[PDB]
Design a protein around this ligand. Sequence first.
Ligand code: HEM
Ligand code: HEM
Ligand code: HEM
Ligand code: NI
Ligand code: NI
Ligand code: NI
Ligand code: NI
Ligand code: NI
Lengths: 106, 106, 106
Amino acid sequence: ADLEDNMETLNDNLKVIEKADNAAQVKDALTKMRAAALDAQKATPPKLEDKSPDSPEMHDFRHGFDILVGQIHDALHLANEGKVKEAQAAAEQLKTTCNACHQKYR
Amino acid sequence: ADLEDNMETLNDNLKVIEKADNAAQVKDALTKMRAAALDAQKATPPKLEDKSPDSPEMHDFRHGFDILVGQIHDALHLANEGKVKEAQAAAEQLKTTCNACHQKYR
Amino acid sequence: ADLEDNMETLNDNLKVIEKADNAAQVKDALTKMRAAALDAQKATPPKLEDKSPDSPEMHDFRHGFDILVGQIHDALHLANEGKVKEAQAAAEQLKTTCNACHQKYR
Ligand code: HEM
Ligand code: HEM
Ligand code: HEM
Ligand code: NI
Ligand code: NI
Ligand code: NI
Ligand code: NI
Ligand code: NI
């Protein structure tokens, strides 16, 4: 999928979590966020159309997604153990990664 | 172990999974693939004998293994929850990482 | 927290594990090591005060923590499955990461 729909997938599933009743709703959204993250990681973003895929910026751009994926996973472990509010807490924490990549590349 | 035996460990365990009966067979092979991945990640590969360990290429070379290890882990979670065919599906997906590193460094 | 207290958190929890009775003691320390690792990863270390945050060295410095976090996680999985001595074995293995970052940046 395109960078922009993956960002809507990231954004949407975030709302799904912060309002979720239960663990399965959380696990499902995190699963979907992981997929989107990983697929957005393949894209070249507007701001960086002038850079080769092995530029330092494209490298750093792809690293922002590694960080998000690691976090999602840590949230997933909490979801997997039925800890729905701390899972929700994690999901909320992801924001500072979202915003760190956005400050520099969006 | 040497880069080349680790690649045979990666390759072999891949066949073990795609033909596995059960979860324990999958978990075991993934465990072994993780080990080999991590050990191959220390090696300097023929194509890159002329580069320092902190060259951008050696950096990128080691990143190909981070991606594989993350994927293996995601497959492991599926194996750990008794999902043997989707675990098998994951293991198959790893191929595009194997081949992405190979296109550029093999 | 500061780089140096996070390193004491890393160091302390390591002793907690290698002497632990049970899985919950291990899971708790690993959880805390993950937190500290991730927080130390934001710091700029003395040796690198003269480098921009996107220098290759600051990049490599932050990667040393990715490796530690991945390992901690692998130890956590063992802890989570009640495997207290192999969890302890993992925790001990972390040392070569600790020391690899230290050789070059401490
Ligand atoms: C869960 C955390 C994240 C959320 C909730 C999120 C959400 C969004 C949203 C809603 C947009 C605008 C989409 C649109 O309507 O066009 C966007 C754009 C963007 N994001 Fe994210 N994002 C996240 C993580 C990241 C990360 C980690 C990176 C960098 C590694 C990143 C890089 C970008 C870029 C480059 C755009 C603009 C692309 C363009 O100009 O077409 N995002 N994000
Ligand atoms: C599970 C995925 C992978 C599989 C199944 C796999 C399998 C193999 C096999 C069968 C070989 C030839 C071994 C021989 O008979 O000598 C090989 C070579 C090689 N692979 Fe992989 N590999 C994988 C992942 C990777 C990754 C991620 C990288 C890079 C990060 C990589 C880098 C290399 C290199 C450099 C060689 C050639 C080394 C030499 O010339 O001695 N491989 N791989
Ligand atoms: C679990 C593994 C680790 C342990 C047990 C550990 C432990 C320690 C300890 C005890 C200190 C001295 C603290 C003090 O009394 O001031 C220290 C310093 C330091 N470590 Fe670690 N560490 C680990 C991992 C890492 C990693 C992965 C990195 C690099 C990525 C790193 C980078 C540094 C640096 C730069 C200092 C010195 C900071 C300064 O000069 O203020 N450490 N570590
Ligand atoms: Ni796509
Ligand atoms: Ni990197
Ligand atoms: Ni996990
Ligand atoms: Ni070896
Ligand atoms: Ni701090």
